[PDB]
Symmetry: T
Subunit: 144 residues, 12 copies
């Protein structure tokens, strides 16, 4: 209906959610996470789409389309956060709000993980609050 | 909507001047208005929220020590203390129950001296740049934990 | 008998005309390609212009230019700041290679000042807008 | 109708007269306060001078000067090298603010060279001894 | 000489151009010639060797994910990805069976931008500067593990 | 009587001794530590006072009084060691000896804990020798 | 008149000994400029005072400048702060590819303060700067 | 005679184009000095040789100096080493708040070698330096 | 006979192999390692000598003799790798190939262990492959 | 005062010249005088103290290896080796019984090249700036451990 | 003729006030040179333009140079790039032990580009440079 | 009545004549020692020349020169870049000490630019080849 469209974009290695360090990332799969956010979104009157790719080209294409559509974006750039200026430069084209989400507490990990090249270029950032961080981002966008 | 699980929201230096403090960055809501809002939002989630603000690191450390003993989850905005105050970071390491760091402004988008938090490594997680709504997200997280 | 030249544009340059017009102009990538092909023809050059957001596709185009000894004018865009895979492709070029930045990268944020490509190519043009590509072609016309 | 000015002295400055006289003089903080009030009166200024080792108390004085639009002359002393809480209070001032260092901080150890306050105030006077405060008042008398 | 334990050799960007790629550094053998050589050398050690090359980080990550699930030992030459590509490093952390990083050239003897590998901390070990023979050393190691 | 007065000053978080990481800090409380040092001091013919504060203002006041009284100081600045130039500048006013004590081995901890801004400005430093480090400082001052 | 000023900094008077001479370069650019309908003058100095004076006058005259600061590029903030006064475009030219040389040569203090920079394209770099200014 | 020398470094001859001119500043400080019973002279140069000569003569004459090194502040050790020869006080003045500008402007190589520094208080900074020297 | 002579040189603390962190270094002694490499070498038609010293003077003398004899060298400089330019400058005199071996994965350890001052000056480097790394070095030299 | 628990005091380079070595910093006592003093002080605490000094890193490493095998507590003054000598640090990691690093001078108050010790992270703890009495404090600590 | 040029940079005209004067040093080196069968000239300037001109002429004449760049050592790449043009040997002399001074004085931008450097051996350092050139 | 001088050569200098002749010459260490003893004799100096790869042996020679107040000319070779134990021995010398490097260490890799010895000795000669030792002796002849 008049339901606000939101795009959740997950970058490299996040297709493997559930196989990795469960105390940090959970045993929830990417398919389980997508279903959860779509359902959570529906309860908030949001029309949520969830996409994951290991391809920077495909991710840049999704960001370019969100720019053109003025679709709010929740992005987890995963390891690209530490270095990928091509992804940061795509995000600068967005018009609607953009929230960066890290599942793990990147500040508590190795020094090479502390800095995000994305954070300066988005609305805000949520880190270390697990998969629930994505739900917080949707909650914020529901009342924006 | 049954207000029973206790949560402590702790605001550090200069946040008592919310509403007058650089409103183009932090907005026009006063600290009193924010405290009332978070208590009301908490009640809707069945949380019993207390909101406290101080410019005194001694008083803040005392509040953190008591939350450690009480096993009370904490939402803390250390404001400028985030950039350097290892005494505040070392108090937060004593907490047992979860702790969420909140920054109203997007610190990564400001001057380089504001980018690093000495607190972030020592808490559960951090919310930055989502305005006063970031406090409500932290409470939402704690409501279902 | 026209000398073949390859112009290669990297990530986000398919969106030319969308943002920051005072830097990048209001022209689309298709409009830029048509302009450089026409400018090349006037100089007696046979110019091909390609754009990709894919480092695999870009590396393939650089490898073919290395095999063909085709001079290259490359705008690596954000890849300039970090992408050693693209720099390692460019070192294999045999004919000259000119790096072009539309914007004055020295005048921007500190993370944009260093190019990992510049040490590995013939030379670099930065800050002279879309006309920078035409200068690169002018240089290659008399080389 | 005398213009109100606030002089605020930070940590360790209550001990003026105790150590390093060749830098800080042999005058006490009480003697400095009396001198600046008298100097201010001669310029038609109503000067108040306050000193604290408490960052809470200092932040409260800065907040009141922000609310009152009172020009401030501040010597943050050692807080200059690290105290972002004091710098974040000073950014809220509306009327001018002049940072004063009695000593030449550039001539001392490297840990003393950088002030976290200087970017956030109108301007800075360093190395001109107790007279630096009088220069700050002279500037504010004609502003 | 009984070819049964499966090993995966994965070559990253620009290695498809071996033979033409800076031959004074990397030698005159083609990638096809190298693959045939390692399969033959593996067979002599009773290893079943597969050799794959890609310029696509997506395709490489997919190969690493499958080796994680298959518990297949990996010999990887990440080439220029070694200097910066944390996405490739984070894929390799998923491997369970051993992983050996190989660099054909002595990266420590080249420009400063080539000295650091982001991969080395996350694998079993690293061989650098021993030419195409470094791949055979990695297989020799895996034959007796 | 003619017993030498010594001041032991403990900075932030040390009022919580006993609650923290016991393998490093012990299960001894600040009250237990104070009683121990006063008794140990008495055996050495020292009149020991032990004070603890989370307040930099209160600590600076105690250091200023030790400067005026020429009282030797044993100080554990705790986390203030890493950054607090106000505390370092107060200690430069001391006339009698000053020994900095760290309970934990700060060199073996995170890099942000390695540097003390206090060490250059005092007589000497004892680190990693636990609560017994305070007794070593008193032993040194007993024969000074 | 479409006047352009080409300004060469320290040691560039020694071009050919340091095989084209500075005189040969100047004659080439004046001729090349004329072909494009530009009135080009070429000046060289080892004096930062003289160079600053030339830049100040170009600021007042709104004359486009092509500058090769040579070694001043790596440190001379006085020259960078003179160039900030220019109103018309200013193109920095480096004959050599400074990115391919020692690390002390990589950074230019001038680049942030000018329109654009051309590096590594040899003496033809000056002709590209003139070609740019011919159509501006 | 209570003589004071005000020395202005590179690009400061362009004050007002770079709205008070250098001539207007000089006239103001000479007049302000006279009111304080000081005999003030104001000199400006883009030449480090000329500036060094002025500093050497001030050293020999024991004349207090107010210096604005402008961009030389960030790098010019030759000027810093001349200032070390001064016997009477020397006050460094910056018109702008250099701490509030780009990071390359934050450090002065002069500040360690002079009596004191005044920054960010505009052209009135020169008058504060004179006021200090009137009572020294 | 016509068997190729190879020198394996082990630097400081490697005389203690077997006593240290066994999950990394093994429980194999230096004597056991020497016997193993000599036997492995013989199977490859190499005449292997294995020497260990805590003395930089003695190590430099062995490298100088390998330079004069044109003997290929396998060296484990151990902690000297991180700083010892005297050892690096001796290795530059070698004519025949030289392979640097680290038993542990130095890249996975503390930051002070990441950089080797030796690696730029030798043929190549093997790290993190345990005592088997020495056998890989000999295998390489057997077909050189 | 019953001399039975064995303690080893190990002094590194240039400490054999105590008394002549920069006496304004290190004092006028000779190394022989210091050794006699520590043995006597140890005896009063019921410790059997041995004091050894060498300019030879090989000899020092040998002494550390034997203390590892003997489980003998060590008091070490590595002197200038503290700033760089990872071979000495890696020997000390083999010790099982406690180890106390002593610096006679306040290294934090000297040139920047003297501030960092590569040894401190690898020992029990460190005493600096308390002169020759710092050795006696280390023995006092070991007497009650 | 075995001609040697000794070139002194900024502030060295003030030797003795900054107790041997620059004139006393020049007379000493001319006399010392003559004893070694060298024809020595000694020149001093605070002008980088004048110094660059002297270096350019020494390059063309293949005259060995002994240079004391004084504060230019720490930053002046224009002077370093002039010295690269020299054909005959060039010895950099520092009167003081620059390694023992402030950290900003430790690095010379000249040292990489000359034959060798002598530091901390006082005015006798110039005589050692001449002694080296007498037997080269 | 001849003034005694000690020339001390550190690690790898026993191999003089073996490698990089364009820097180090084709002369052996024995040939260099004979040359400096003869050069010293001509200046009225009694010169002894010693070389070691052992930091213990070198520290012992420096300690004896400190006790004897013998001027020292030292080439610490690679120890210059890191060996604080050798620098701490040299600080104990009473008579002058001149550090000599045969090669121009400023012209080599960045790891060779810094000497930990130079701050602690009278002065330094670098890049003037074997003749650098003779210059050091010439300086000591008139001191």
């Amino acid at each position: 209906h008049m339901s606000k469209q939101i795009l959740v974009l997950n970058g490299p290695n996040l297709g493997r959610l559930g196989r990795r360090e469960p105390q940090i990332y959970g045993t929830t799969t990417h398919d389980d996470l997508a279903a959860r956010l779509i359902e959570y979104g529906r309860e908030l009157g949001l029309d949520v789409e969830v996409r994951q790719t290991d391809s920077e080209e495909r991710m840049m294409g999704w960001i370019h389309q969100a720019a053109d559509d003025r679709t709010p974006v929740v992005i987890n750039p995963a390891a690209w956060s530490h270095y990928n200026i091509a992804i940061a430069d795509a995000l600068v084209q967005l018009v609607a709000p953009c929230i960066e989400v890290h599942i793990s507490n990147i500040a508590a990990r190795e020094e090479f993980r502390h800095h995000s090249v994305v954070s300066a270029h988005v609305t805000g950032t949520i880190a270390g609050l697990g998969l629930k961080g994505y739900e917080l981002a949707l909650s914020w966008l529901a009342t924006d």
